Subunit: 115 residues, 4 copies
């Protein structure tokens, strides 16, 4: 259940992850298929840790949108023939005032398979 | 300057330490939780995320690899400054590991957290 | 998009909702596929509201679980010309300590289809 | 005691009134939110839920049908005994917005939480 490689999800988005070093880490690019203003979508980075020990490991990473102010974070698990990432996310928008915070965070799921 | 470099704590009593936030926003760090499913097990734990640098009240996100367990937590939120001090409004997801894909529906867990400097 | 009728979600679970009154309110039953103690699973009742005016109505409801201390609430929206409910959910558990609160809440989703 | 019947404020300003909690556990009530997307429109909105009866600190859930928007919120949580003897509520919630196409589903569920107090 190597997280390296090229994956796609059910909302059409695609990602690529670099090599995983043995202390958990990976780097990747994210191309989102869907967005708040898909007038402005580009390639966004992505930093994350993944257990290297259990064969169906938990994990988590961070996407940093280069086209807006928000952050999306993902956790989930890889299962086995074929590998499937079951994930969930929080998409945090930026609000101008802290008193506005309550409406900043959304949540959702996604399912990834290799390409 | 809302840089997450430094020491932060939160409402349940956890302390984290973030190092250098690099030019691309990235930062390693460590997190001592004051609370887990098996709190007897608690150890130190490594942490990796990215922040926005431009934004004056930056949005952020990081991943905690809990070594003392098979699971993971991701955190997102925003840094704010009206007392003049800096609060981190964040929400998180705990991912537990189930054995089979069938149990997937029961693995993800959610909550909030409020971090301030030490 | 009436919630009256016999739906079924993606995990295998089953529900039946009755008549929705003029102010959006409805009741029905929920036989679940899954649970944290499957040998316990029984018929549990539900209660929500559904915007009556919308052609693709938003709605929310609460399952009160017969066989245990805990509660799941759902929201979502109903799309079309076949009908489909997109829902996310929060499962709330009894902790016995409020210092233990941060862990009594869990999240997921469900797609619902008529039967 | 930890019954829902009563009036409750929350860490964010908003208030709520809950009616009689029947045998089947149900309850009815109203809710003025202190905050929303178009706060000019905020009115009293209805509420409907179910809470576990016998247990001393019950789980519960209820649906808030937003009278001014086309949106819905669900809250879940528990009634605890804060040591002072006073009942605080711990919840988390979803807020569902309406979207025009099923393809936009992914953007319509906000998550958050609150703390209610007796009023």
């Amino acid at each position: 259940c190597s997280l390296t490689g090229k994956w796609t999800n059910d909302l059409g988005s695609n990602m690529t992850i670099g090599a995983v070093n043995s202390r958990g880490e990976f780097t990747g690019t994210y191309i989102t298929a869907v967005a708040d203003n898909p007038g402005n979508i580009t390639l966004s980075p992505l930093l994350g840790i993944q257990h290297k020990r259990a064969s169906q490991p938990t994990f988590g990473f961070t996407v940093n949108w280069k086209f807006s102010e928000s952050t999306t974070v993902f956790t989930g698990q890889c299962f086995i023939g074929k590998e499937v990432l079951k994930t969930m996310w929080l998409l945090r928008s930026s609000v101008n005032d802290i008193g506005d915070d309550w409406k900043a965070t959304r949540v959702g799921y996604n399912i990834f398979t290799r390409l």
